[PDB]
């Protein structure tokens, strides 16, 4: 398989890393959605109303014949203990006893992590996921950094390898959020940008602050990070050690064989463009002429179409 190209902090080093095979696994958007929605819902904090909410007050129904609507009422006659009443218990109370987590079987979760990484290698998928990769020279961008602890020296690698545009737009947004979110402890939405994967090459100190950059170990690649917003196609930058260890991490699973590669839409279309099946195709019957109906009697021509001998009768 063509060796990927390792780019140095300013210009490519003479380093070629064989494409790890995880990249050829089919890109299934369906599985990468099912695994994600379930995985994110897995990480939630339960919300409910008080069990003693509304039921705290005391109301014995006034009852029919006193002209009061029939609803439990307090000493004066105030609405209580009803969803339609002010201060009453919501008839169906919310619950802390919910299935907050939606479990996924291990094979399926690993399937998706591979599917996202292989979509990431497709350059087109990243562009669609709203990343300005036109500058980045070769995706997967394996940028060899021994160690970076200074933010400026990290900016340096990102600017030189054409990631500058992506990082700039992550700071450029940072708008205040829309709706009740501000008061709920999520005041700022910083648009997500590139993801840097490291294997013992410390890049944590230098790349953590910059906005839109997230750092993960090769050993753990969290789906929520591999696809922001349940969409596959992240801008991915790899420290040399991490990219080299991809096919090594992918042999740690005792029985995880990679999912078999499928065929793309273009290749199946090429198979139908192929003369093999073009030869099998044979022309069918010619479509039957339908037309519209006009009175033959009114026009000599229609009478001619229906009967040639009949039309010449007037002479």
């Amino acid at each position: 398989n063509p060796t990927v190209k390792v780019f140095g902090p300013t210009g490519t080093q003479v380093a070629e890393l064989p494409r790890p095979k995880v990249f050829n696994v089919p890109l299934r958007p369906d599985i990468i959605n099912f695994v994600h929605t379930q995985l994110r819902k897995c990480l939630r904090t339960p919300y409910a109303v008080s069990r003693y909410a509304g039921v705290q007050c005391t109301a014995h129904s006034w009852g029919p014949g006193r002209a009061v609507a029939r609803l439990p009422r307090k000493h004066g006659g105030i609405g209580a203990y009803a969803n339609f009443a002010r201060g009453g218990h919501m008839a169906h109370p919310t619950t802390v006893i919910r299935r907050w987590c939606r479990k996924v079987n291990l094979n399926q979760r690993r399937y998706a992590v591979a599917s996202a990484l292989a979509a990431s290698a497709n350059a087109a998928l990243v562009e669609a996921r709203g990343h300005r990769i036109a500058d980045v020279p070769s995706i997967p961008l394996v940028v060899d950094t021994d160690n970076v602890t200074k933010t400026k020296d990290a900016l340096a690698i990102i600017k030189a390898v054409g990631v500058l545009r992506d990082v700039e737009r992550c700071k450029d947004s940072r708008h205040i959020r829309a709706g009740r979110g501000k008061m709920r402890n999520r005041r700022y939405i910083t648009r997500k940008g590139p993801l840097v994967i490291y294997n013992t090459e410390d890049v944590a100190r230098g790349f953590r602050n910059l906005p839109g950059v997230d750092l993960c170990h090769v050993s753990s690649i969290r789906l929520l990070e591999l696809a922001p917003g349940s969409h596959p196609g992240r801008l991915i930058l790899w420290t040399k050690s991490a990219f080299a260890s991809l096919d090594d991490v992918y042999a740690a699973k005792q029985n995880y064989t990679l999912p078999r590669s499928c065929i793309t839409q273009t290749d199946i279309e090429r198979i139908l463009q192929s003369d093999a099946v073009q030869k099998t195709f044979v022309p069918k019957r010619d479509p039957l002429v339908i037309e519209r109906k006009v009175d033959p009697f009114s026009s000599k021509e229609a009478l001619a179409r229906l009967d040639p001998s009949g039309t010449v009768m007037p002479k």
Binding site: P26, R28, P29, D30, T257, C262, I263, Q265, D267, I268, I271, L272, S274, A276, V277, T280, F281, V282, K284
Partner: protein, 178 residues
């Protein structure tokens, strides 16, 4: 005001495009639909429908039944509609060429050792669109246990089974009990 009711008996519901969100599976039906539209070859027509069937309707045709099915003519390619999973009950399996939507990891190994080729459906489209030298087989669709407990256990003319443990003499011992 047309009374067309007497002539017909109502529309019939049938799958047209596989509902599976698997992109790869939609692509293959679309291809066998392009091929079927151009040439009316029936193999192509059944192929289109078999991909369209439900994941329960399409059954597992294990290699041992496959070998028994093709024992007379192993040369003929067999296009199994669904997942082929090998059965180790048949110790030795003969050379066979089978085109299936999925092959189990164990199955691939058994036909590979047997010198047989497990060619994928895309390869089938490339080589044999017509289905020449190809027989389209499928497993027992009635294999499912849910198919066995379907029905009305109780009424004498069912010969099916009640769902549960029951532990009840009433009705169990003969048509004269109950």
């Amino acid at each position: 005001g047309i009374d067309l009711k007497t002539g017909i008996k109502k529309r019939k519901v049938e799958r047209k495009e596989p509902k599976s969100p698997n992109p790869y599976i939609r692509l293959l039906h679309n291809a066998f639909k392009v091929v079927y539209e151009n040439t009316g070859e029936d193999f192509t027509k059944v192929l289109t429908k078999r991909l369209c069937l439900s994941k329960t309707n399409r059954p597992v045709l294990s290699v041992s039944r496959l070998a028994h099915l093709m024992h007379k003519r192993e040369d003929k390619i067999a296009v199994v509609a669904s997942t082929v999973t090998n059965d180790e009950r048949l110790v030795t399996i003969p050379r066979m060429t089978i085109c299936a939507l999925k092959f189990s990891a164990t199955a691939r190994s058994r036909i590979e050792k047997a010198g047989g080729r497990c060619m994928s459906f895309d390869e089938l489209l490339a080589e044999k669109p017509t289905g020449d030298n190809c027989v389209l087989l499928q497993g027992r669709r009635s294999c499912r246990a849910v198919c066995k407990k379907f029905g009305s256990p109780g009424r004498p003319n069912s010969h099916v089974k009640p769902k549960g443990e029951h532990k009840g003499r009433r009705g169990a011992r003969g048509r004269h009990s109950w």
